[PDB]
Design a protein around this ligand. Structure first.
Ligand SMILES: CCC(C)(c1ccc(O)cc1)c1ccc(O)cc1
Lengths: 265, 11
């Protein structure tokens, strides 16, 4: 009756999830653990291996920029792609496209980055991150070696990733979890909160049922994810703070317009 | 001027 509908919803969200996001967590873990028969990644652990694998595992390449800014700029454009993938997914959530268009923008403005970090964990282990649709692996250590402005820019996403990955969620749990984040009825500037809260409540129930059936032995996996949602806010907060340090302490800082609009806050 | 809005309106 109501639960059968909560399972149908969970499966719709998963089917749309697999459409919007090519590199699933299942595939990413298959590569990180070494379980794929379809090739293997190129490791970038120092400045020399970056050069050899620069044109490799890549997303007019003559930038003449410092390695730190080129990496950072590489991050910008995977985020640009991800913002588009998240938007395609958010529009597949039943009832989203019927929201006030300006409320949709607000939900995406304050939600994309929370979801990018969540899904970024699926590509991360304690040693690095899968990059370029699984073609490359960038060591966490190599990212800290960067200059002091950009050296503590990815470590935060690593700390959260290792902890979030301890929960052992799959693509089904993440599909609903992402939908709940997007449908937050407490995003600043929303004009019609109640219709957003009604959707999230129905999503939270599908998530709770999803977790009980999928992780029947992991008691309190729901209350743990509700806390992670709160963490993701402070994590993005500290992230936006760092960006303004760069924008203020760094020159020659080209930023993609889509991120300028999202970051305007 | 909203890029996010143009993304939201595309099919
Ligand atoms: C998975 C790709 C990755 C780690 C990234 C970074 C930030 C983000 O929000 C999404 C993805 C990336 C890509 C290019 C690069 O030069 C450095 C890092």
């Amino acid at each position: 009756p109501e639960s059968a509908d909560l399972r149908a919803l969970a499966k719709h969200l998963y089917d749309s999830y697999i459409k919007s996001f090519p590199l699933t967590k299942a595939k990413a873990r298959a590569i990180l653990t070494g379980k794929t028969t379809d090739k293997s990644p190129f490791v970038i652990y120092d400045m020399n291996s970056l050069m050899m694998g620069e044109d490799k595992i890549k997303f007019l390449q003559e930038q003449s920029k410092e390695v730190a800014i080129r990496i950072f700029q590489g991050c910008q454009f995977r985020s640009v792609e991800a913002v588009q993938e998240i938007t395609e997914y958010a529009k597949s959530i039943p009832g989203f496209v019927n929201l006030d268009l300006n409320d949709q923008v607000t939900l995406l403005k304050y939600g994309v980055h929370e979801i990018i970090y969540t899904m970024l964990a699926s590509l991360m282990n304690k040693d690095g991150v899968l990059i370029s649709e699984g073609q490359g692996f960038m060591t966490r250590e190599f990212l800290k070696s960067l200059r002091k402005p950009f050296g503590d820019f990815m470590e935060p996403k690593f700390e959260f990733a290792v902890k979030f990955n301890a929960l052992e969620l799959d693509d089904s749990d993440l599909a609903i979890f992402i939908a709940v984040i997007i449908l937050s009825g407490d995003r600043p500037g929303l004009l019609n909160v109640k219709p957003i809260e009604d959707i999230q409540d129905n999503l939270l129930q599908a998530l709770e049922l999803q977790l009980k059936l999928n992780h029947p032995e992991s008691s309190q996996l729901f209350a743990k994810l509700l806390q992670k949602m709160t963490d993701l806010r402070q994590i993005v907060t500290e992230h936006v703070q760092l960006l303004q340090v760069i924008k203020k302490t760094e020159t020659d800082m080209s930023l993609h317009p889509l991120l300028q609009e999202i970051y305007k806050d | 001027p909203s890029l996010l809005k143009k993304l939201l309106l595309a099919p």
